[PDB]
Amino acid sequence: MYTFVVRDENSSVYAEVSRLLLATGQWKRLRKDNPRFNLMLGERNRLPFGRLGHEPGLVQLVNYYRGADKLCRKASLVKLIKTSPELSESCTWFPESYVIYPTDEREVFLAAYNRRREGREGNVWIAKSSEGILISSEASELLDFIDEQGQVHVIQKYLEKPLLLEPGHRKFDIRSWVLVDHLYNIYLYREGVLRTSSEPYNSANFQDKTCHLTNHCIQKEYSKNYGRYEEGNEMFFEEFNQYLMDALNTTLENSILLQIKHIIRSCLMCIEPAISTKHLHYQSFQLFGFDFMVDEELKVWLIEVNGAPACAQKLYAELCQGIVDVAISSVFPLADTSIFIKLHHH
Amino acid sequence: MEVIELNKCTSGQSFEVILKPPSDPSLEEIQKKLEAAEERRKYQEAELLKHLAE
Amino acid sequence: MRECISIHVGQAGVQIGNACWELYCLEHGIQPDGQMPSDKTIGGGDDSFNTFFSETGAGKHVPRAVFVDLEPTVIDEVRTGTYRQLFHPEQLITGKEDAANNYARGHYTIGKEIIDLVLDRIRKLADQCTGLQGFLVFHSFGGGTGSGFTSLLMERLSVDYGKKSKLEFSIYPAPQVSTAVVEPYNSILTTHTTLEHSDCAFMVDNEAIYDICRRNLDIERPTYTNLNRLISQIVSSITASLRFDGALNVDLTEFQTNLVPYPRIHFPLATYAPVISAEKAYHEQLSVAEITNACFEPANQMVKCDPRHGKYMACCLLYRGDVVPKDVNAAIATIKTKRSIQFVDWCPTGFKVGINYQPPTVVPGGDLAKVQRAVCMLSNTTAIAEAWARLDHKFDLMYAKRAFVHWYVGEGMEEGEFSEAREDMAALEKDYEEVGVDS
Amino acid sequence: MREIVHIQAGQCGNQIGAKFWEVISDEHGIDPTGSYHGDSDLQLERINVYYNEAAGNKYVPRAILVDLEPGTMDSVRSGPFGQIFRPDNFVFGQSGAGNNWAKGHYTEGAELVDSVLDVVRKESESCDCLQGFQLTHSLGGGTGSGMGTLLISKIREEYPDRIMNTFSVVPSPKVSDTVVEPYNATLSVHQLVENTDETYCIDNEALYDICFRTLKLTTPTYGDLNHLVSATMSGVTTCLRFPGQLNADLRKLAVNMVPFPRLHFFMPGFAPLTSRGSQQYRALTVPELTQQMFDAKNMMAACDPRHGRYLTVAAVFRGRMSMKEVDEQMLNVQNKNSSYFVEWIPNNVKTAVCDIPPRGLKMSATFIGNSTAIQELFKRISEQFTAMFRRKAFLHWYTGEGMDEMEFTEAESNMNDLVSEYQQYQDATAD
Ligand SMILES: CC(=O)O[C@H](C[C@H](C(C)C)[NH+](C)C(=O)[C@@H](NC(=O)[C@H]1CCCCN1C)C(C)C)C1NC(C(=O)N[C@@H](Cc2ccccc2)C[C@H](C)C(=O)O)=C(CCOCc2ccccc2)S1
Ligand SMILES: Nc1nc2c(ncn2[C@@H]2O[C@H](COP(=O)(O)OP(=O)(O)OP(=O)(O)O)[C@@H](O)[C@H]2O)c(=O)[nH]1
Ligand SMILES: Nc1ncnc2c1ncn2[C@@H]1O[C@H](COP(=O)(O)OP(=O)(O)CP(=O)(O)O)[C@@H](O)[C@H]1O
Ligand SMILES: Nc1nc2c(ncn2[C@@H]2O[C@H](COP(=O)(O)OP(=O)(O)O)[C@@H](O)[C@H]2O)c(=O)[nH]1
Ligand SMILES: [Ca+2]
Numbered sequence A: 001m002y003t004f005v006v007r008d009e010n011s012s013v014y015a016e017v018s019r020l021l022l023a024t025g026q027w028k029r030l031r032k033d034n035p036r037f038n039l040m041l042g043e044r045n046r047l048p049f050g051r052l053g054h055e056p057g058l059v060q061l062v063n064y065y066r067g068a069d070k071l072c073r074k075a076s077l078v079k080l081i082k083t084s085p086e087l088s089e090s091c092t093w094f095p096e097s098y099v100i101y102p103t104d105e106r107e108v109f110l111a112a113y114n115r116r117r118e119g120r121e122g123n124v125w126i127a128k129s130s131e132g133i134l135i136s137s138e139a140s141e142l143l144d145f146i147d148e149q150g151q152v153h154v155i156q157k158y159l160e161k162p163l164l165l166e167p168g169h170r171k172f173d174i175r176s177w178v179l180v181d182h183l184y185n186i187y188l189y190r191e192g193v194l195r196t197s198s199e200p201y202n203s204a205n206f207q208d209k210t211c212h213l214t215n216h217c218i219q220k221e222y223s224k225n226y227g228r229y230e231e232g233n234e235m236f237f238e239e240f241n242q243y244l245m246d247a248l249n250t251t252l253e254n255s256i257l258l259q260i261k262h263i264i265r266s267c268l269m270c271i272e273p274a275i276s277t278k279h280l281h282y283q284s285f286q287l288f289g290f291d292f293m294v295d296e297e298l299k300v301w302l303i304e305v306n307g308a309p310a311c312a313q314k315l316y317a318e319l320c321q322g323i324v325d326v327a328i329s330s331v332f333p334l335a336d337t338s339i340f341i342k343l344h345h346h
Numbered sequence B: 001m002e003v004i005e006l007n008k009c010t011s012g013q014s015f016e017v018i019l020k021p022p023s024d025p026s027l028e029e030i031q032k033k034l035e036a037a038e039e040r041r042k043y044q045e046a047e048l049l050k051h052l053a054e
Numbered sequence C: 001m002r003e004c005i006s007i008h009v010g011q012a013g014v015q016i017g018n019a020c021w022e023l024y025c026l027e028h029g030i031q032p033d034g035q036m037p038s039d040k041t042i043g044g045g046d047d048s049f050n051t052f053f054s055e056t057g058a059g060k061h062v063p064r065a066v067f068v069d070l071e072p073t074v075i076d077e078v079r080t081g082t083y084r085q086l087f088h089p090e091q092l093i094t095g096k097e098d099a100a101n102n103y104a105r106g107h108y109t110i111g112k113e114i115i116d117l118v119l120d121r122i123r124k125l126a127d128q129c130t131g132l133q134g135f136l137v138f139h140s141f142g143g144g145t146g147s148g149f150t151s152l153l154m155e156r157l158s159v160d161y162g163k164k165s166k167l168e169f170s171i172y173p174a175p176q177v178s179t180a181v182v183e184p185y186n187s188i189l190t191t192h193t194t195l196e197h198s199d200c201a202f203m204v205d206n207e208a209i210y211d212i213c214r215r216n217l218d219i220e221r222p223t224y225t226n227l228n229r230l231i232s233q234i235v236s237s238i239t240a241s242l243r244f245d246g247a248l249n250v251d252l253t254e255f256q257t258n259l260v261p262y263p264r265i266h267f268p269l270a271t272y273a274p275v276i277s278a279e280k281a282y283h284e285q286l287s288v289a290e291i292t293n294a295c296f297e298p299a300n301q302m303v304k305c306d307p308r309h310g311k312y313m314a315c316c317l318l319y320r321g322d323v324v325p326k327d328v329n330a331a332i333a334t335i336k337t338k339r340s341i342q343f344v345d346w347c348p349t350g351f352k353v354g355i356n357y358q359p360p361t362v363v364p365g366g367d368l369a370k371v372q373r374a375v376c377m378l379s380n381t382t383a384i385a386e387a388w389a390r391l392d393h394k395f396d397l398m399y400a401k402r403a404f405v406h407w408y409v410g411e412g413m414e415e416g417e418f419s420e421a422r423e424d425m426a427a428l429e430k431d432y433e434e435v436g437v438d439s
Numbered sequence D: 001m002r003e004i005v006h007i008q009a010g011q012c013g014n015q016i017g018a019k020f021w022e023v024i025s026d027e028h029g030i031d032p033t034g035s036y037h038g039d040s041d042l043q044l045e046r047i048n049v050y051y052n053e054a055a056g057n058k059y060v061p062r063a064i065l066v067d068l069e070p071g072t073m074d075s076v077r078s079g080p081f082g083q084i085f086r087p088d089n090f091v092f093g094q095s096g097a098g099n100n101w102a103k104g105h106y107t108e109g110a111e112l113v114d115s116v117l118d119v120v121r122k123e124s125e126s127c128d129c130l131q132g133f134q135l136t137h138s139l140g141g142g143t144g145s146g147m148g149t150l151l152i153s154k155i156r157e158e159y160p161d162r163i164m165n166t167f168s169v170v171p172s173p174k175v176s177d178t179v180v181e182p183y184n185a186t187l188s189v190h191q192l193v194e195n196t197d198e199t200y201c202i203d204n205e206a207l208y209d210i211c212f213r214t215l216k217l218t219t220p221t222y223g224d225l226n227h228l229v230s231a232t233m234s235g236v237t238t239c240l241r242f243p244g245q246l247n248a249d250l251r252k253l254a255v256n257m258v259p260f261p262r263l264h265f266f267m268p269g270f271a272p273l274t275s276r277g278s279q280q281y282r283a284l285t286v287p288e289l290t291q292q293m294f295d296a297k298n299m300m301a302a303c304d305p306r307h308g309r310y311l312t313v314a315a316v317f318r319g320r321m322s323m324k325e326v327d328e329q330m331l332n333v334q335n336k337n338s339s340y341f342v343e344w345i346p347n348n349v350k351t352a353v354c355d356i357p358p359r360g361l362k363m364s365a366t367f368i369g370n371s372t373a374i375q376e377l378f379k380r381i382s383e384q385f386t387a388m389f390r391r392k393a394f395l396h397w398y399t400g401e402g403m404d405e406m407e408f409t410e411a412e413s414n415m416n417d418l419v420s421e422y423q424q425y426q427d428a429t430a431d
């Protein structure tokens, strides 16, 4: 029999993984502080990586890649995109971003901002904490806000001309679930979700944050048309592929997924030499939640990566079994066709 | 690539390569602590032999 | 020429000592009777090898070494071993009752009885020195004598030799070969007490050496003999700079200058390649590029940790055999683009390199194969702090319930010294984080 | 070297004591005359631990034989290794203790104890470095129970910096019908809790159940019980008697086994369990040894280890086997029973492998466990005690010898505290 410990009780995904593992009847859940485990479903912050892989006669696996926070923190990602010669300024798929402290690139931001005003280009930028998100066309408003917040934010270029779903004229973001296993095989879960707005995208007023921010949370609370177009503001790839064919005369695979598949690879390939557990005394896998925006010319933009991503109610069952099958069962085999797309790299 | 301070002999040679540049208790206090221990040892034993007398 | 006095404390220290002086003797061509035909200066001399070996008028090369244990068994095997004629009887010091895996017995109860005798015997060697450099101290973290007696000696040496460097070779405990449950206690207690009196300390995780033996030398269940033969090759590579002609690490002060910018953060990580099986009839001989790259693989480290999730304060490559500068510079140039080597902002991203053309000596009928070129990388990385964290957690688990604490209080110690030692390790962990991490 | 002084008190003490000397004398290649006729030098490397050397390379057990009855010590002399013992070290009275603790500890035993200590001193004097004492005795009787615990106290007063080891045979109604044994036992445990560092709980309940159920002996003899004791006693002392790294002396054992001073009562285990004079042909595999030695049916204390948690464990494998396999199987046990090992004492299981097997077995394993389950044994004695002491039954035997009801109330309270103390650490968690 194999053994595992659960140190994140909140994690809805790994709450279902633990449920599935026990149900197989070849896994056993220990007390969280029992060191004699094979699998660790570890805590979100301050995970004791330093202690993993020092128990003789136990292969030890953890549900997190150490140093993946470089990708999943907003300020870290900006720094990563800029500084990495692998991503470089040959990166056309990440919105112009600057790390602003209340060392600091607050000076250089204004230089890029002044160029836009004399160019008369859209000068609307978004400030995001590492609700809590201000969008303004005036720079003086954004900087005074960040100083009042007190924490380190990122001034990102707001996709002013996004792709809008009809009928409704609605903004949206795409959530793609990626599973990196202990051999660093990048698995894109074939099912994603469109976390849509329920109010028509208003170009003029940016203070009405319901039609500009497409989070499930700010929708279900502040939205006035919640669930009218699609259930729980979640359109799936079957209905979205059909819309693109019916409206735009293209497929989801051609128009979008090729770019999503390029970005997921680009990001994870870049950090492989820093986080990889190929020749470590313990092994790592991790589920990621990549957030994407699509503009009016069907060009995908990366918004952020989520290190501890929550799955869509509909999908949980399928994806979680996939994690068990692909990530866990691969290291620890059981005793006596693919939901993932293996993003080929070398 | 910047090799500096190359020293060669018969047994071998040594150098430095740079990729990038930058951006007690006294003898008394010991004896004090060591006896303090032995005095806690003797007291523990004394109270045993006292308890064993009883 | 500046003299170095080796001191071997407890079983681990003494047995690792034998492995070293056996290997040193072969490397210098010193026979087991102590005679060195190659030496044409009979009685004395200021040769590189004299730093570790004194000379008698008869031409016997006698190690500048003191073996101390509170039990006669282990040192009796030095007295009656192959290299029995090598040492004076005064150099081999023994008690009758050991420290019973109890730091308290080693430091206080038993330690205090023999400390004065040991210093007196160390002073006899010191008086033979024209200019004493310092001391190399070999001991276990886990043992009662190794942990307890060493920290007492290291305190007294600081008093009696104020200006003299003190290097450690500390055997970090591993449960595969560990003989006591309370080794975490003994480890923290000694590390705390010794911290102020140690200039530079090379930790050796038994688990690391055990796994390298299993994986690289195909040894089913390694014995101390197996570990000691490998440990000796690492110690020999580090001390080679003192015992042979060279420019890099030629005296004990150079070690702290080169590896230790922060006095408390004085624990370098040693990584050694290649380790190849004598059994292997055919083996490919590894290029300079391959052995250099191997120093950044956690498998080849003396302490298992991830330098990628830390920062470097100093990096030092010690080559032996068919190695030229051109090859090393090339190997490093290629490694730089591939590997993840982040230095702290206040240190320059550099590698101090030393080459000895004599390839590594191997004891005949041993495990290790004869190789054309080998390397030992000494790097001061904030990843070694993992070793402290692991040890510190085990300390907290037991001390929470005060398990086995009565054994220490019984020998005269206070619960104060435990919590005091742990708060110093909590500070050392925080120090390593401050130097190392941004977030 | 590190000498151990052996003491055997009462009938039980002198019987399991005699069998111990018969077994280890054979293992060290020493005949009844005390002359070495062994093949291996490993037999002699650590002989001085249990044997005094004499004129013409003659090895004499460092053993002191004590009883208030001449009966058992005439038997020992008449027995096979009866002539090996030092004649002067036979210290015996004429009037027994009649299964009365008071008689052994206060009245009858008080007379003879000074004569025993004279022999202890003589043996202690000629030790290069005495590591301590081991006592064999029963807690059910009078001499071993009462006088044994008096000696323990009187020796500790003269040697307070030396380890006190005991093989204490705990009584059972399945073996003895003596009604007052629960009293004798409870009074004895109170003494042991305070004045011993290591106590091997040899439970007559377990020894009888092993003989009846496992070995299929419908009518077990004391000899059938002692065969298990002598095998166990050979096993647990293996590390002391042969060259090894782990638990090589009595102090180092205590430092590895006793996390709290009062909790020093061990569950001995042995595999394979054998019938007396029955020849095992099939050698046990390393996995079989490992599973058996940790099994409830292979425990010399009548306690279920799955009803408690292991504070510390010491496994001793004997015979030629794969050190790789033992290491694997021992990890296998821990990794698949981690609920029954306290998580707040990391790496609390320690394993030793000795090349030399015992007589009759190609391979064997001996188990020393500091489990909180041992409370079951003390609870059983406590229930039997309170049954009688509640109505003050059979106290005239003890109050006639000068004792007070208070001593019984105190002995009862200290045991009930020992039980709840074990229960305290069983229910204790990492946080
Ligand atoms: C068969 C027998 O007599 O066994 C005895 C041991 C059992 C115990 C259960 C272990 N006893 C005492 C009995 O079977 C009792 N029954 C009860 O006590 C029972 C009655 C109902 C209520 C519940 N109780 C428990 C019988 C009435 C006897 C004995 N074992 C020995 C013995 O081992 N003899 C050895 C020598 C010896 C003696 C004592 C200590 C160490 C060594 C002889 C040989 C080597 C051997 O092992 O067989 C007894 C002493 C007499 O020994 C001679 C003898 C006589 C008859 C049969 C066997 C042996 S009594
Ligand atoms: N590498 C190596 N480790 C050893 C050796 N001997 C012991 N150890 C380790 O050191 C610890 C035990 O300490 P010892 O050196 O045996 O003890 P000691 O210094 O003699 O002290 P006491 O016997 O307690 O008085 C454990 O972690 C062992 O694994 C050896 O020869 N080589
Ligand atoms: N550069 C940009 N241009 C336009 N809209 C953007 C944007 N960056 C973010 N947004 C919008 O803001 C919303 C939330 O942004 P973000 O994902 O940074 O916040 P968040 O971290 O609280 C949610 P999560 O953690 O699940 O990704 C998105 O739904 C998106 O529509
Ligand atoms: N296992 C075992 N138990 C014994 C032996 N002799 C006596 N006992 C038990 O010990 C208790 C009586 O102790 P005993 O040694 O006769 O009293 P003493 O001689 O006065 O100390 C009873 O529970 C007996 O069953 C023996 O040889 N082996
Ligand atoms: Ca010379």
Ligand SMILES: [Mg+2]
Pocket: C010, C011, C069, C071, C098, C099, C143, C145
């Ligand atoms: Mg020792």
Ligand SMILES: [Mg+2]
Pocket: D011, D069, D141
């Ligand atoms: Mg009797």
